[PDB]
């Protein structure tokens, strides 16, 4: 699909947010399209990548690879420009079989997603507490 | 949270599907939550699994792993039984630093369920198709 | 199932008296719940465990093993507290494919407790005579 | 006990089901004394065997093993006759002191047997539900 | 025990502060139950840990072991967000015999717990002054 | 403080008894000021070990261990002189950095005791249950 600067709604934990990321590049060496949510400075700015990797000599599944890579910055410092204190980070990597049918998946696709806004995860991620 | 059965709704490609999981165990050896959308037999059940793991010695982020794995079946063959012919997978592991919060974590796990319903998302895993 | 109290029911040669099992642990490294009549002393107390476990790389079938051990004691010695002079075990160890089904797997359970009350297996547990 | 045709009653899930084994061999030379639901064809019965062994050299306990073995068959193939497709197993091994009673014994035996029939057990055996 | 909301009363120098701490895993590779009074960032937060471990081959006696880490936190820096200065620490270790009894364990208990408020264990822990 | 009579009450399980221990011992090698119980002989008496140990060399935190060791004697044996059959012990040992403060130690001095006193400790420790 076209890379173009895909528009994120109704994010973050109280769901009001907004995520505009535009296009910013191919194929560094290995295929995986970039965007970014852009900002002052190249380290500052929020990122994603995506990857379809068709099957190969190795490889014999389909794996699309997803990566957000999320940095804080904080301003303050023993100079002036902001610097990166740390990363949130992201990836989901899926695999399919070269007979497997879109319905499969856009199922796992659907899942995944409709799974990340469950109390399971919701625990699991936003405040770090295993399962009981 | 509570290991309790989790109801996902208007999943699929036309997102009019509902998938239930229940609660199917935990701490097999390594802390890994599982549920399990119950079918006429193991093999045959699709699988989510949900682990946090605490930093320690090696480990100085949280991560959180979530996995999908779903079978499909079919019960023609040289026998009467249904047997598995290929598996769709997802993997995502979340990194997090001691130091984050959780409105970060909130908005890498937000994030990628919205991007996970955006068209570049939809083309690269229901269709397979790379980016331009 | 709920780690609860079990109580089991007339049980004995007789098959007059009672067993309470308490729950007594999960997870001491090896996902063996545990459960265990509560007597005067750790040692003197009769245990059960009850362990599932998935299919892995090396195990390909699940495997569910129960064990007893229930001590006896004598009190007397050339000492005041009672002291464990021999134990009685049972281990029994089920093995079932990824593709059995839980009438499959019901049928051999009621099948076993069904074979222990059988004149056969009382002979050979009970009076430790072997079968001709 | 004189081997002769044990007949067990309600069993399988619903508890109304009848098992009916006959004689079929003593020794082969372990002294294994087996039994068997009288089938069309070897590989398609439901087995059973029982051995009592004394204590000797390396073995310093009484040790009583039961097993249980059924097949399912399925007709339909690339070929006429059915053909056994898995196999689900008991195995319970009871060990016992030279110094033990009949009565703690008997004790083992009914427990187990009563442990058989508790939700627990049915969890972990019908299900392949761990306990939590 | 359920892992619950454990509240703390009448703790600090002058016997007047209060502190709660809530569930936070369990069994993260190692039976250890977890603690954490709620902060606002994870590295920031006063756990607890208890693990209680049976008898094994190499360990012959019970293992009670409980752990207390309190960071403090200093948020002036060459930076924005609050950052982990020190460490204090509190780890103990009860050890029972198979044949010891609740009495002489709570003894134990109780009385460390007595131990802990008087004058020889005030000025050893909150002046680290040793004694004469 | 001066190694004096310290008396402890309302330990045990009951609440209600009463412990006297008296100076018994500085210096033995190792900086351990030593406490007792008034014993018939020597091997009977409860004892308890303080030491607070100074950062050095190696060590760059101040160090505080207490240690209790409760003994049990049997008076009837095949002999007419008790005899020790086994010890309870509880080993603490506090961890403080050279720039703690003393509310910083107290506070954990104080959540220790306070935490001793707490439904999830009195059944790890005093039943041995683990926590769920």
């Given at each position: ?7 994120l ?41 995506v ?58 696709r ?14 699991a ?8």
């Amino acid at each position: 699909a076209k890379l173009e600067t895909v528009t994120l709604g109704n994010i973050g934990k109280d769901g009001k947010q907004t995520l505009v990321l535009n296009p910013r590049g191919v194929n560094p060496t290995n295929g995986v399209a970039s965007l970014s949510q852009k900002g002052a400075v190249p380290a500052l700015e929020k990122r994603v990548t995506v990857s379809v990797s068709q099957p190969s000599r190795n490889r014999k599944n389909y794996k699309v690879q997803v990566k957000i890579q999320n940095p804080t910055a904080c301003t303050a410092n023993g100079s002036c420009d902001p610097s990166v204190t740390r990363q949130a980070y992201a990836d989901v990597t899926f695999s399919f079989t070269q007979y497997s049918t879109d319905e499969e998946r856009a199922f796992v696709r659907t899942e995944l997603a409709a799974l990340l806004a469950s109390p399971l995860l919701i625990d699991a991620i936003d405040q770090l507490n295993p399962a009981y």
